[PDB]
Design a binder for this molecule. Structure first.
Ligand SMILES: O=S(=O)(CCO)c1ccc(-c2ccc(C3CCCC3)c([C@H]3C[C@H]3c3ccccn3)c2)cc1
Length: 235
């Protein structure tokens, strides 16, 4: 259907295989911030003195479904309502109704150069592995090469591999009666592997990650709750 179908499959399947694992029991992940059910972990990793620190967070959001969370995360039309670190954004290519390529710039983090990013953003539903397991909605955003990448001399090109992975638990329907948002919970695993693509001071990037990832998860999840309240559920 498009030239990135196989790459998309590999990237999604890699998150399904490796990103969903629990890390509460795993001393190799450092728990850096906890705010209720929001648990943010990282590993301290540098390659050539540049911070790569894999980030992984879990959260549990009442009253929204994974399909809703993923749609709001993927939909570029609502990006401005919840993003706080983007300066500019351009849709570079549409590949499918569920997959686009995006160019964006982030606000400068002093004293490093501003960063830009060029990535494929795809939204997929993954069927239950067995009839015991939940279905998964996943958004994966991962860097790719493209010819219609802008010249932007202020920016160093970062590379990313991010996934927002959601499983939704509900009270079953009681005969002919809908499920209430009161009885729905969206379990989130969010992972972010960012390569700043060049020099940046490690302590500054680590301090920024520690602040901004929790702020993002809080703001974004609250936004989804706020926008879906009193609207019919989209499972
Ligand atoms: O979840 S998404 O796919 C949503 C679509 O945007 C996502 C989230 C985060 C990033 C990102 C990009 C650049 C940086 C660094 C690299 C050197 C200088 C800036 C960081 C580190 C600094 C951390 C951070 C966390 C949250 C928001 C912004 N900043 C993060 C990209 C995409």
């Amino acid at each position: 259907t498009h030239r990135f179908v196989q790459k998309v499959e590999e990237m999604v399947q890699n998150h399904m295989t490796y990103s969903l694992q629990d890390v509460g029991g795993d001393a190799n992940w450092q728990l850096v911030v906890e705010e209720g059910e929001m648990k943010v972990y990282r590993r301290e990793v540098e390659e050539n003195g540049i911070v790569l620190d894999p980030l992984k967070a879990t959260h549990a959001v009442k009253g929204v479904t994974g399909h809703e969370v993923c749609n709001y995360f993927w939909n570029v039309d609502v990006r401005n309502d919840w993003e706080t670190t983007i300066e500019n954004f351009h849709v570079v290519e549409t590949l499918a109704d569920n997959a686009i390529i995006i160019y964006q710039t982030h606000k400068r983090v002093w004293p490093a150069s501003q960063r830009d990013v060029l990535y494929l953003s795809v939204i997929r539903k993954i069927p239950a592995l067995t009839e015991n397991d939940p279905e998964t909605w996943i958004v994966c955003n991962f860097s790719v090469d493209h010819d219609s990448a802008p010249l932007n001399n202020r920016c160093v090109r970062a590379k990313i591999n991010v996934a927002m992975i959601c499983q939704t638990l509900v009270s079953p329907p009681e005969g002919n009666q809908e499920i209430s948002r009161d009885n729905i919970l969206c379990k989130i695993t969010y992972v972010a592997n960012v390569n700043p693509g060049g020099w940046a001071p490690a302590s500054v990037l680590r301090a920024v990650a520690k602040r901004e990832y929790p702020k993002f998860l809080k703001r974004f999840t609250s936004y989804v709750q706020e926008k879906t309240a009193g609207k019919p559920i989209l499972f």
